[PDB]
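Title: [Solved] Protease 2A 3D structure

Original question kept below for reference.
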Amino acid sequence: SGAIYVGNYRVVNRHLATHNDWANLVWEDSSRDLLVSSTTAQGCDTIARCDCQTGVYYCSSRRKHYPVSFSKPSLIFVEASEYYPARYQSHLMLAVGHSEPGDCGGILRCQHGVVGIVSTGGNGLVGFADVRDLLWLDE
Ligand SMILES: Cc1nc2n(c1CC(=O)N1CCC[C@H](C(N)=O)C1)CCCC2
Ligand SMILES: [Zn+2]
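Solution (posted by the thread starter after getting help):
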């Protein structure tokens, strides 16, 4: 689990969105596994606006942060799960690292701020849903 709180927005994995997130929907993309909802309290996280391919991600299944090198966001094939059929997920970034389904929501972060959240995993690879192209989160 996990979310990014910036301005009057809450950013979560779409497959983990709650009833309140759906009732206060701002935007969602099944293809990216992202959902954004509105909030009453103001959020203070900083979103990275950069091209950096190294960072650190939080892994709840190990209570540890791991430094990683990750690929640029792209279309990657993702096997079937109970939330989605086997499809291509866009704006996805891959690194060699540990993950479990309960690790989705864990933040990936560089020196410039929040890069994205854990979305996928398998075969010793962890995938992150990028959020750096969502310029409207800052306004
Ligand atoms: C984080 C994670 N790590 C692993 N796994 C997962 C979970 C995973 O990839 N899902 C399941 C939830 C929806 C995700 C999606 N964006 O399509 C795909 C699956 C088992 C092997 C290790
Ligand atoms: Zn950066």
